[PDB]
Amino acid sequence: GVVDYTSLMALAPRSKNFLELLGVFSESNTRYIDSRYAEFEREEKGVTKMNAMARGGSRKYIGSEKARKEIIEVPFAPLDGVTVASEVEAFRQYGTESQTASVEALVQRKIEHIQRSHGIYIRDCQYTALLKDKILAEDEDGNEITALAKNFSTLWGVSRKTGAINTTTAVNPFSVLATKRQEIIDSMGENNGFTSMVVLCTTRDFNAIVDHPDVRAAYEGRDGGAEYLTRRLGDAVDFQVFTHKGVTLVEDTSGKLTDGSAYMFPLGVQDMFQAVYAPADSTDHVNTISQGSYLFLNAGENWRRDVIESEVSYACMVTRSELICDLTITV
Amino acid sequence: GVVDYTSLMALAPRSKNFLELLGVFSESNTRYIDSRYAEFEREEKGVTKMNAMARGGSRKYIGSEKARKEIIEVPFAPLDGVTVASEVEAFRQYGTESQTASVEALVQRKIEHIQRSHGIYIRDCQYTALLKDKILAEDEDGNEITALAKNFSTLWGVSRKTGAINTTTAVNPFSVLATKRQEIIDSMGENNGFTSMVVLCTTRDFNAIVDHPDVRAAYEGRDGGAEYLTRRLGDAVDFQVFTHKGVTLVEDTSGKLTDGSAYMFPLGVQDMFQAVYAPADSTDHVNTISQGSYLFLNAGENWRRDVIESEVSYACMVTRSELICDLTITV
Amino acid sequence: GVVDYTSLMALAPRSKNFLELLGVFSESNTRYIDSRYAEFEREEKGVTKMNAMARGGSRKYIGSEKARKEIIEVPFAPLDGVTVASEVEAFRQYGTESQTASVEALVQRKIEHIQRSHGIYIRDCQYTALLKDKILAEDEDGNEITALAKNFSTLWGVSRKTGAINTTTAVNPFSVLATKRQEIIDSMGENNGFTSMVVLCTTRDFNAIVDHPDVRAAYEGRDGGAEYLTRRLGDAVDFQVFTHKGVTLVEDTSGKLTDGSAYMFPLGVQDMFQAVYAPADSTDHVNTISQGSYLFLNAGENWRRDVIESEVSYACMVTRSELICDLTITV
Amino acid sequence: EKGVTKMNAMARGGSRKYIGSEKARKEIIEVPFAPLDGVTVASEVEAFR
Amino acid sequence: EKGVTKMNAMARGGSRKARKEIIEVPFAPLDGVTVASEVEAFR
């Protein structure tokens, strides 16, 4: 005795995170797998490398295999903690025919509460993947599950870069930023086609870097001058941006970044950031196409109560971590 | 002989006061409870739902066991003062295959007036909760009902921090503000999800605290890209904002805040400012999900008149009162 | 697929504990509330809940006044003993209609066991309330739940009197009890209506104090018996009573008191000891008046057996906790 | 014994119902058998009355 | 690598996290073989 209410979860579509708005974990590089386990492929030169010159008449190259590919388990996080009292049994009292205003309001409030909660968990997963290079999997007590929190620059065999920006000293911060940009470019090689070079920093770090004597005049004159790629692509989100010496300073106002810690990384690199939604934990949605976030009304359980079961499986992957630099500002 | 016109009251949604625009109280932290009593949970040092959780057959935690909950009674406030004229009873004709333009105009004007009054009441409640650190329950003679005027600091066993700013001495006010900022940051613990650090004040306090010799030049040489406050909340509220040293002085232009007192709180902290909506006061509207503000047409109370009955039960809640600092400004 | 069998709980009502027999708790002050939360009013402001009236025709004035009150959540403790031998559902398959031979025996045993266990629980609650001033809330391992184990000396801001009597010493133990009788008398106020000055203690302490040189001349040299009001009223149990100098010693042989703990408190004071029952934990039994101790027959939840589920929600209350004078006896 | 029907505790409204049973002291003994069959009816109406 | 030990319980009351990894199984064909048209007796 369980009713599926996942289709109703589109009444309150999720907003876009800051990362999801920059395009880092966009809706393009996001899949809906059919199983608990997800295969993340690293693009390598040689597997589709036609090259060579063969010979007209025979010996056709059947290039395949020898591709780096690790399968991980998508962590499972339920938000089933709930107890509907009446709630129209979350059924909207036959939401098609007898949809009253009170029932619609209660349904919308519950759906928007379920969304804003999964979206926070998804944001935590994304920021953990970007800032700490691991899958977000922790116990209820708050201790990481080593059996599911696979590190990123260990699974592939890469290592991030480092940095140091003392804005109190006279050295230009953008000199160091450009040097690290060049070091990151040198580590791409084959395709090396990227939209922009962004530096994700906090408000304090942003204002400390910008207010440097070497950069002030430059910021005062332009301050972006409405001629930035991000400002022209979004044109609606309001955050500080600054393009100078090839690196685009971006201000993150969410509280997720510790002060004195910026993360350089390139935008537009293909399959550098991937994420996927695994299916539910039921025996009817197993081996079934994932729907993102799942909502179920449980009435066959204990006759005393009646619970609203909600769940989501979501894991992020950084398939090339050599291109991210962990800066350290000393404002 | 009463007709429920609560549904029609969404025709003219009330505007947002300064606290709603600033993000202190919004639709994200507002719950439509179904009883006279509201339960508020204090999650100290970070709140993050939707953890990883094992997949398939596993524990779907639908409730919390170890917590810190409090129960309060949400004050009631009706504003029935009205008299629907026999012409102002076009409500019975609205949306009934006879709704002309005049009927819609009249009903929307009435609803706009009622919502203006309700928004004034709600603004009073929110400002009382933010500044006075208590629930707004006051008798017709302006005397506080001690039964319903619960103080948050005593309700949680915490105490707001205090500080004194002397804008006539040689000490820099912003050094003191930075010390209070550091104290608040230390108090937040592992949350650190704060978007900004607002210091709400009045025109006199703002103009006297920034004209200090150590901050006069910085104010004079400021930029129009102060922060999200001047950007996001721009073109709607003409206020004065000046970010400096991490603390964002914002001056209030509603008169609800008195001179000589400033309140310094972090924006964006999750489950720090909460609001609830009780249901109506009627046996037909008991044990039901609240609809916010109610509008009833009482056409069976007298033979002479026909009164419009309007009512709302609402209360704000500050679950983290150790993160707000009360500042005394001596001009 | 359950069936409600709480009506049969009246076929064998529980016995009457020593405190219940003594009149400390009774069915007069025992409210069967409708919600999970119980409201207790300390009506210490004389007696003005009801009074005289006048002005026939129309002077009803139905609205009451407001006094000091506290809202607490009553603990919910089940005992799903299960292990129901088939025996046609162990009750002739609801064989309370054609209850010919075996129903009135197996059923009688089942309820005489269930209500015996519930009476043990309720006696524990009452003794914890009177001896320790707190609601009995415990975990499975025996760790107190602080959310529900609300003390009584802080919920009302009153302090119990304390004393110590050394039987070995030469001071008359009843002289000490004479003074602390007055201390409780003064705090009663102007609505003093106590029946007796109960000094309920243990057998060892009773024997030690009555064997004091000053006391034995009156205990042996009098103790008229069948003249003490408690002895005449009860006359159905084995307990020693000695009413000397107003003080009315009562030996408690129930084993709930640790030696050297005499708890002096007035008896018969109206609304000083209150008890509350709460409904079950079912959707059917929500917003329903408490029916005492519940009992259900769960069959379809499992296949290996059929389960009987008993659920009692109970909590005592000592409002005027300033009259109980805990004592310490050294022998 | 205290504990087998000890509802006590405080559980929690919504789940975790205590199914208290077992761990009860219980010994099974054999009931001694004593016959008083020593008798010999002569007529006695064959004790059939 | 954990404990699955059994323990005593009651007549009622229910009573009763493994790291597994997925790999690609290497493929190895030795299809080099020619039928002699007399070894076509595989019928």
Automatic annotation (TrEMBL), chain D:
Source superkingdom: Viruses
Name by which UniProt lists this protein: Major head protein
